[PDB]
Design a protein around this ligand. Structure first.
Ligand SMILES: Nc1ncnc2c1ncn2[C@@H]1O[C@H](COP(=O)(O)OP(=O)(O)OP(=O)(O)O)[C@@H](O)[C@H]1O
Ligand SMILES: Nc1ncnc2c1ncn2[C@@H]1O[C@H](COP(=O)(O)OP(=O)(O)OP(=O)(O)O)[C@@H](O)[C@H]1O
Ligand SMILES: Nc1ncnc2c1ncn2[C@@H]1O[C@H](COP(=O)(O)OP(=O)(O)OP(=O)(O)O)[C@@H](O)[C@H]1O
Ligand SMILES: Nc1ncnc2c1ncn2[C@@H]1O[C@H](COP(=O)(O)OP(=O)(O)OP(=O)(O)O)[C@@H](O)[C@H]1O
Ligand SMILES: NC(=O)NCCC[C@H](N)C(=O)O
Ligand SMILES: NC(=O)NCCC[C@H](N)C(=O)O
Ligand SMILES: NC(=O)NCCC[C@H](N)C(=O)O
Ligand SMILES: NC(=O)NCCC[C@H](N)C(=O)O
Lengths: 380, 380, 380, 380
């Protein structure tokens, strides 16, 4: 029996790698993906072999991540419950996509991951796994094992000889998520010095910085005049935005599994792109088209959040969003200053921003008022 | 004949007052409403009697404004095209309401306003008027007079003897709007020194300032532990937020009367209220209720923007929003720092934030995955 | 230990009654509700005692059913996937509501039902049970026992002295549902003679029959001038509509558990009410209100279909629908002929059916066209 | 000056042809389109010449009408206010599209139509005209001339040699609309013998007729195994459906010009297609996709009704609808009987109508119920 494990290289997925061998007595193919977490994946790969993997694979997926997941999602203007830019949500589908690919390649009947039974990630990994390969089997150790505590796990790690040691965090090219630990108290401000991707505003440059982003057909293609690949462009904007401490949000969100959760996120580049896109949309999108698109954005967002990426509903909405986004061509000029991003200008080759006279407006008004007057009259 | 004129005490409404007497040779009742424009409305009222007003009326409407218009709208989470908090939009209905009432009290056959024939305001004034009194006669001088240019208009004023004097402004308790003139070029950053209600971010306190807002069944009832009437509360928050440069928006919006327009808005208190409300909602609203409310907010927003306040569709949606808002009770703790508003804490007496067995998750996932698996299998 | 069992009197629930006694060594309190199934509930209540219940309860819940469940649902214009009037769906919450109440009165820690683990009803029963009493225990034998087929179940029943008597059925005052067996092949027309509540259209009266239905504030209060209570009103319309073969539907629907199912439904009275309601709405509801309402109806229908009746989302939407329905006052006149229902007339005290001239229309047109013209000019 | 007139051949457009020549001192190019009104278009073309047209064009647009307007609309499941299949609405854009093309080829600066200044058609003609050719000049005689009565118009007609001859009618391949006159009283049943496209159910065959409709990729491509072009197919279904009196609707609709009107429509073929489509969709569309699609259909319907065909909103939604519709491939089997259309069967090559055990179902319920249980416990 072979099991392809989504291995990140930490203590848990290492314990899980051992656990899978003892519990199933199968070969465990470890897979580590580079999506910008800031770790050297080749290390995790070698640690995977050391830990017992029969085969470890490491792939650089930054470009695929931004090009085929982050960008399509951004075109839709996806935002979960007012503030979440879905940094972790869009990454999972990519990983799962590879786990199943590798499994079909290695002749592995199952895949495994270390997401807990209480979170959203388990749903994301599995819904995409089953959607891509219905016959695939999934193993989620967190839902199957007996450990009754952190302590038991560390011990178990030593029993097997695995290197060992306030909040949990997930980091990739789009953002860094922080939650759990002291963050569980919604009334408690995140601890000083917690953020890693964005410099702290109180320490950000005293002078504003200006940045311009060019969009071609729904996707950002250049920064300050320099053409950049999708992954390179996201990186560039994280640097510029991070320096100014841009893209910080603190929210209590609704998980798909049923309960609320306190989350803190930093999305510098993505936050710049969010506003840059709308700034350009303000000149290139028709009024009614925009209004309809914005009322659908929330649904698309919850789809992505729940894990329905490789689902027909999301791909259907995607057809609408891409169609609208095809017109988003132009440039946004933004001003960054201590945690804040201010749009200060925008231009577009086909801006709709430049017919009728005074009388016309009066007729428009009369026709629009008709039903309200009949209403009042009837209420007589 | 009698004509009730929404008189703001400015050049144009003064010109309009003379134009009304000279043209219709009717009795002109001037009406100035104090909605927080920061003008000694009493001056306006005297200046009107001194401009030919057969009777001038001034009313302090700050409380009614915030209580009967701003709060119901905030309760719904109204945001036009992603950034506009509708500062000017919700104020017009209030004015037209009184215009019509006064007209009925003074036995006047018609009312008048000085909104131009190219804007949204004329629609807001007139839809309100027609909805409240279908038989009302409306006179919009900007659509009826021959004046071309202001050089001309200045002449006419100087003529009848009427005091005479970069962008246009509209101010009230909720915000200050800037548009036109130097603002018409979408690529041009607004001019240094334009903002009046907010302190320039760069000139804002070097130390962050925390503020708490208490909501009771949808509405803000206190700040930093001090109970404050609707108007006093918005005022208090404008002061606190203004000093930090909070609530600045720069957008190119879609007008109802035809095309696009570049607008700049500062809504310090409202911006704080927007984030505070959502912070309290994150603990008191059900997931599915929230996702539905947010998908309807945009529609409510354009209704307000277009001028459909006293309209059946808006009042119907209001029933949905008021129902949901009734549960929003708690306190939000926010951190203000150089133009930004950060939520750092929230609490609620009836918080839904805390029967959970992880294996249940797997069953949840399998059922959710079914339709996806069938789909893939059929794709064979 | 006591268990409140939803006992319908058939073979399965009788077998379930025995099963629960032995399996849980619990005292079983049977509950049978009269919701218009057309059976003598008292005979079910007696059989329960014969079968072993420590107590048997039987209540006439037809009035509460139509008044507190069917009527509120109809006000919403609820239709699942274009045709399903939700006859079985809105009935389930009412049964469960009583199980929990009785359980509360008898000091029972659990409730049980005979819905299978493959369909929608189990979800409905339990979601309402959990929502009304969060700590109640539920027992669904179909998900807990291991019978390997009817054969074995008959034997089990015979063993306990439980009398043992092409498709499945569910009937109540709203409709009769048929599915399973012969009906599983979606390409096969239902067998002749299957329908019970409605006359075969080919056998309906050669003369059409006119009927008038009066609505007061969103609810039907009279038929042909005779004031009738909710339950009696549905009954009357079932008679009149049934005699003409009205209300027959044949569809393949999407289940909440994840698959597709072929269902046939007859809803004579409800189908007449559906068209009668819209007929009265056509004179009493505002255009924009109606359009917003119809776009929310489907969401509401799926909530009902899924089982989220006692859920905050459904209650919220209800506030909107009720607000709108309050204007539906008037009379609908329909013509019934061989399977079809034809609206033939309508009237209302506050009808909005019968303030501008031709010139006004041109202005309306010019303004609505502006954005379209700009778009075309930019396309050049 | 050259004016391209939408010439129907009747009295008013003949009067208009003369009116235009003398009023604008221009030559008139008459355009008559055959869209299935059951008229001899060449007779209208020749009558135009006799009336003074400098050139008369007559085109058979039946295939284009159904292929490029009706089908796209049906693919979206478009239905206005519950019953209107938009028979007249989708035909208007097609007419105007040709008026603009002819004006362009003929060097005409303007186009003219005979729609009155108080209806919906004027908006449809002009919105598409301006959208396709922004600088085109539109002349609508009804909003411009001074005729003050029918009598004066007849005298004018006779003066110019134009031959002169209960409700009004509009007929094309999709339907026949009836409104005005005796039909203006919403409480009055339409007069006997009014219908023309459909036989009265009272006179329809005693034997029901089965009909099969094959859908390829969202569009109907065959009837009873016979491959038919769009127009030939709609025609065929009108014959079959008409013989059975199928597709009659009687509604009071909300006009775009702000008021209500009583309309009676017979859409035999379109009605069969409506149900046929949903029958095939019941096996080919995913649950979530269908639900989203049905919530957007009404919006698309109002767009078509108001006249926003060649508009960005409609084309953006169309991208969504066409995406979904692409999966609609299969055959629908319906039973026609005295006014009714019954779906009795459906099949599809990629039917999603054929993965979990009861245990899975329990986990699903538990998770789905969590938030509801938390809500209940909090309410205490
Ligand atoms: N870079 C990555 N490559 C492959 N799989 C990953 C990666 N990041 C996360 N995952 C998958 O997501 C699941 C993990 O979660 P989280 O990201 O919450 O784990 P950790 O607890 O942060 O890391 P570790 O489990 O290694 O200690 C993992 O068990 C793994 O299957
Ligand atoms: N406080 C107020 N009371 C009554 N009417 C007002 C008030 N503020 C604005 N209005 C109405 O709105 C129309 C004005 O717009 P705006 O406020 O944009 O006008 P202005 O052109 O800035 O001022 P003015 O017309 O006095 O020179 C006015 O002409 C007036 O009829
Ligand atoms: N009138 C009713 N009163 C109480 N519970 C009912 C009633 N009708 C249905 N139920 C509940 O719904 C579950 C049943 O489903 P259905 O109605 O599909 O069952 P059956 O299989 O038709 O009947 P039986 O279980 O008696 O053989 C039942 O087992 C019962 O728990
Ligand atoms: N088949 C057609 N070809 C060209 N234009 C048409 C056609 N049908 C309708 N129209 C246009 O739509 C406008 C008409 O409406 P309607 O069809 O309601 O007019 P009528 O009143 O029936 O005909 P007439 O104007 O000849 O008296 C017409 O005046 C004409 O300009
Ligand atoms: N620190 C974390 O483990 N966060 C992972 C992302 C969780 C986030 N609330 C999400 O659902 O996307
Ligand atoms: N500065 C102004 O005169 N603003 C008037 C209000 C315009 C604003 N864009 C609105 O439509 O509400
Ligand atoms: N005959 C039946 O067993 N039907 C029970 C109701 C099923 C129906 N399709 C529903 O889901 O409500
Ligand atoms: N008989 C007619 O003149 N009807 C033309 C169609 C009008 C219909 N109410 C519509 O607006 O589509």
């Amino acid at each position: 029996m072979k099991i392809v494990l989504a291995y990140s290289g930490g203590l848990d997925t290492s314990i899980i790698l051992k656990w899978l061998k003892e519990t199933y007595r199968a070969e465990v193919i470890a897979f580590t993906a580079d999506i910008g977490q800031g770790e050297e994946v080749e290390e995790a790969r070698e640690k995977a072999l050391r830990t017992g993997a029969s085969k470890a694979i490491a792939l650089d997926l930054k470009e695929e991540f931004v090009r085929d997941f982050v960008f399509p999602m951004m075109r839709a203007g996806a935002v979960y419950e007012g503030y979440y830019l879905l940094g972790t949500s869009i990454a999972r589908p990519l990983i799962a996509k590879h786990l199943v690919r590798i499994a079909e390649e290695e002749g592995a009947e199952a895949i495994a991951h270390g997401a807990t039974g209480k979170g959203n990630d388990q749903v994301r990994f599995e819904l995409t796994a089953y959607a891509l390969k219905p016959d695939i089997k999934v193993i989620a150790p967190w839902r199957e094992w007996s450990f009754q505590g952190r302590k038991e796990m560390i011990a178990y790690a030593e029993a097997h000889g695995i290197p060992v040691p306030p909040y949990s965090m997930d980091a990739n090219l789009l953002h860094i998520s922080y939650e759990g630990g002291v963050l569980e108290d919604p009334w408690a401000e995140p601890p000083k010095g917690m953020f890693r991707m964005t410099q702290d505003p109180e320490e950000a440059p005293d002078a504003p910085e200006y940045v311009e982003v060019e969009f071609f057909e729904g996707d950002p293609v250049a920064v300050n005049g320099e053409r950049l690949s999708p992954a390179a462009l996201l990186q560039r904007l994280n640097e510029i935005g991070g320096r100014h401490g841009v893209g910080r949000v603190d929210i209590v969100e609704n998980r798909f599994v049923g309960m609320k959760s306190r989350g803190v996120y930093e999305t510098p580049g993505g936050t710049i792109l969010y506003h840059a896109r709308r700034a350009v949309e303000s000149l290139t999108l028709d009024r009614e088209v925009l209004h309809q698109r914005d009322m659908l954005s929330p649904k698309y967002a919850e789809l992505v959040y729940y894990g329905f990426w490789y689902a027909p509903e999301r791909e259907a909405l995607q057809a609408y969003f891409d169609h609208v986004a095809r017109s988003v061509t132009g440039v946004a000029r933004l001003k960054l200053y201590k945690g804040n991003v201010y749009v200060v200008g925008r231009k577009a080759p086909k801006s709709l921003y430049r017919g009728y006279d005074q009388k016309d407006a009066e007729g428009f008004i009369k026709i629009q008022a008709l039903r309200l007057r009949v209403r009042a009259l009837v209420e007589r």
